[PDB]
Amino acid sequence: SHMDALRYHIEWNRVAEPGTARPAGRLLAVISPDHAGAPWVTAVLDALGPDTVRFEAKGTDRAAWAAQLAQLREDEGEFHAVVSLLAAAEALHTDHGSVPLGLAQTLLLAQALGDAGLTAPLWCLTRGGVAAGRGDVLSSPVQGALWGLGRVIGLEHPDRWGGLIDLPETVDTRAAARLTGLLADAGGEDQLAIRGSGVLARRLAHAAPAVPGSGKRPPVHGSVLVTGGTGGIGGRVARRLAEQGAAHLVLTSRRGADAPGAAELRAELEQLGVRVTIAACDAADREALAALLAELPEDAPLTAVFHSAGVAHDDAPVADLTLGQLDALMRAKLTAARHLHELTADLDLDAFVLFSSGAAVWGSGGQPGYAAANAYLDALAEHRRSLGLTASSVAWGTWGEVGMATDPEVHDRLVRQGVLAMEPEHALGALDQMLENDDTAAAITLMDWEMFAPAFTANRPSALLSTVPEAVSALS
Numbered sequence: 191s192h193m194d195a196l197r198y199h200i201e202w203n204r205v206a207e208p209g210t211a212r213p214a215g216r217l218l219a220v221i222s223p224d225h226a227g228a229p230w231v232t233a234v235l236d237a238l239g240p241d242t243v244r245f246e247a248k249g250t251d252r253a254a255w256a257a258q259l260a261q262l263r264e265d266e267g268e269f270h271a272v273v274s275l276l277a278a279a280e281a282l283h284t285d286h287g288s289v290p291l292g293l294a295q296t297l298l299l300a301q302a303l304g305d306a307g308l309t310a311p312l313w314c315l316t317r318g319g320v321a322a323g324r325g326d327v328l329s330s331p332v333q334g335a336l337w338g339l340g341r342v343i344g345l346e347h348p349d350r351w352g353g354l355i356d357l358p359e360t361v362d363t364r365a366a367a368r369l370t371g372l373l374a375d376a377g378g379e380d381q382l383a384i385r386g387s388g389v390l391a392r393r394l395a396h397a398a399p400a401v402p403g404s405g406k407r408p409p410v411h412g413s414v415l416v417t418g419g420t421g422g423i424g425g426r427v428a429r430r431l432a433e434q435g436a437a438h439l440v441l442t443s444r445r446g447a448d449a450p451g452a453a454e455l456r457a458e459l460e461q462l463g464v465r466v467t468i469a470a471c472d473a474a475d476r477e478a479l480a481a482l483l484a485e486l487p488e489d490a491p492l493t494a495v496f497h498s499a500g501v502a503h504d505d506a507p508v509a510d511l512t513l514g515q516l517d518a519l520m521r522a523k524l525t526a527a528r529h530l531h532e533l534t535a536d537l538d539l540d541a542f543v544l545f546s547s548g549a550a551v552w553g554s555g556g557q558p559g560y561a562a563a564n565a566y567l568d569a570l571a572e573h574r575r576s577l578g579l580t581a582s583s584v585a586w587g588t589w590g591e592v593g594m595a596t597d598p599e600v601h602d603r604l605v606r607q608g609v610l611a612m613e614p615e616h617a618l619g620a621l622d623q624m625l626e627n628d629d630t631a632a633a634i635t636l637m638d639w640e641m642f643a644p645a646f647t648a649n650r651p652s653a654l655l656s657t658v659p660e661a662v663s664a665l666s
C-alpha cells in the first residue's frame with residue numbers, strides 16, 4: 191500500500207454545461223497562417239464570429255509580434271480573451287528540428303502578449319491533444335505537448351492565462367456553443383475537453399490499488415533497450431530488469447561506456463548473468479538507433495523499451511525561454527520517442543515505457559520546456575494505445591539517491607514544494623505495479639499535500655486537485 195500510495199492517474203470528469211451567451215467584449219484569435227486549413231480551425235473561427243479580431247502569427251519573431259500586438263491593443267482597447275489556434279501548426283520548425291512550429295509560436299505568443307501589455311486571458315485550443323472520455327482517441331501527440339507548456343504558463347502568468355480546451359474532430363453547433371460559452375465563463379476550469387457527450391475537465395486522482403497478476407505482464411526476456419541506461423534511474427531500472435529475467439540489456443546514452451559509473455554498472459549486471467551492451471549514441475539519431483536494432487542477437491530479439499534518456503537543465507521561465515533552449519529539451523523526448531515508436535511499431539514489443547515528469551502532469555514553474563517535452567511522452571503513450579500498440583508513460587515525482595534531483599539545489603526546491611524524494615526501491619516497486627496492471631499512464635510520486643496544495647494554488651485555484659482528498663483537506 192506504500193507503493194500504491196505513490197501512484198496517481200489523470201481522469202476526466204464531466205462538468206457543467208456553460209452559459210448560452212458569447213463573450214460581451216471582443217475576442218482576439220491568433221492563427222498560424224501556413225497552418226490554418228484544418229477543419230477544426232475553420233469551425234472555431236466560424237464559431238467566434240466575424241467581429242473577432244484576427245492576428246496572423248508569422249514566423250517566430252517575438253519583437254515583431256510584440257509591436258503588432260501593441261498596435262492591435264491600442265486600436266481595439268482591451269480584449270475579453272485571446273484564443274490561440276497555433277496548435278494546428280504541427281510541422282517542425284525549420285531552424286529547430288525538435289520543436290513543432292505551433293509550440294514555438296505559442297511560447298513566443300505568450301511572451302509577446304506580456305511584452306505588449308495585452309492582458310486578456312489566453313486560451314490555447316487543441317484538436318486530439320488529450321485522451322478524454324471513454325473510447326477517446328488522442329490523435330495528435332504533437333498538440334499534446336502544448337498542454338505541458340500551457341499548465342506552466344498558468345503557474346507563471348496566472349492572471350493572464352485562460353486555459354486549454356481540446357476540440358472534437360467535428361466541431362458542430364453543440365461543440366461551438368460549449369466553446370464560446372467556456373470563453374464567456376469557464377466556472378474556474380482551465381483544462382477542458384469538448385466531446386459529443388458534454389464538457390469534460392482534467393483531474394488528478396489516486397490510482398486503484400495494485401492487483402497482483404491482472405495485467406498479464408509477460409516475463410522479462412530477450413533484449414531490453416534502456417535509453418539513458420547509464421544514468422541514475424536508467425541504471426536502477428536495468429538492475430531490476432536483470433534480476434527479473436532479461437537475457438540482454440542494451441544501455442544507451444550519449445557518453446555510452448564513458449558515462450560516469452558505467453564500468454561498475456556493467457560489472458554489477460554481468461554478475462547477475464545478463465549479457466550487457468553499452469552504446470554511445472544520441473537518442474535523437476535515427477540512424478544509430480536503426481544500427482543498434484539491426485545488431486540484436488537472433489536468439490534475443492527486442493522485447494521492451496524503457497526510455498529514460500533526458501535532460502532538464504538549461505530551461506527558463508516562460509517569459510525568457512529561447513527556441514534553442516526549447517529545442518535542446520525536446521530532442522531526447524519528442525525526437526527520440528518518435529524514432530523509437532516508428533522503428534519498433536512492427537516488433538510486437540511487450541512494453542514501450544516512456545519516462546515523463548510531474549512537470550508535465552501538474553506543471554512546475556520554471557520548467558516550461560521540460561514540461562512540454564514530457565507531455566509529448568504522455569500523449570504519445572495514449573496515441574500508441576489507439577493504434578493497438580503497448581505503451582506506458584510514467585511521470586515521476588522526485589527520486590532520491592540517484593539521478594537528476596540529487597543536486598541539493600534541484601532537490602531542495604522540489605521537496606520544499608511538497609514533491610518529496612522517493613526511495614528507489616519504492617519508485618521501482620510502484621512502476622512494477624503499473625506494468626503488472628498494464629496501465630497506460632501514471633504519475634509515481636511521494637507528495638506532502640499539506641505543503642503542495644497551498645503552494646500550488648496560492649495565485650489561482652486548481653480544479654485538477656479537487657479529486658485528491660488530501661489536497662481538498664489542505665485547502666479547507
Ligand SMILES: NC(=O)C1=CN([C@@H]2O[C@H](COP(=O)(O)OP(=O)(O)OC[C@H]3O[C@@H](n4cnc5c(N)ncnc54)[C@H](OP(=O)(O)O)[C@@H]3O)[C@@H](O)[C@H]2O)C=CC1
Binds near residue numbers: 417548
Ligand atoms: N530523477 C528524477 O527525479 C526525475 C527524472 N525524470 C526523468 O527520468 C529520466 C532519467 O532521469 P535521471 O536518471 O534522474 O537522470 P540522469 O541525468 O541521471 O540520466 C539521464 C540520462 O539520459 C542520458 N541522455 C541525456 N540526453 C540524451 C540523449 N540526447 N541521447 C541519449 N542519452 C541522453 C544521459 O546520459 P548522456 O549525458 O551521457 O547522454 C543519462 O544517461 C529522465 O528522462 C528524466 O526526465 C522525471 C522526473 C523526475
